[PDB]
Amino acid sequence: MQNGDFQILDYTGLISTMPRVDTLLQSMNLFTEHFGRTTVARIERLDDGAGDIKAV
Amino acid sequence: MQNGDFQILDYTGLISTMPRVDTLLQSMNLFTEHFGRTTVARIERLDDGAGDIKAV
């Protein structure tokens, strides 16, 4: 490259940096994905157990 | 799945829970199984041993 209007300079290439991007949690694949249609979602839960049978 | 009268929503999934049932004693196989016919059973014992001899 030129310097001022009559001299020259040496060019030493570019230097670039970027910040961190952490993907440890994402990499573990813990989460699942579901694709739907509406903006309101429902969930259902069912609880079941057992009984203590006696003698007769 | 139906939301309020004039709106809808997306059903996602079902969640179910139940208390644990233990099987350790069953696994150890410490009990022998007998299939009888009546509602009464008999057991026979026969215990034997020995004594000490005195000088005469």
TrEMBL record, chains A, B:
Protein name: Putative major head protein
Organism of derivation: Pectobacterium phage phiTE
Source superkingdom: Viruses
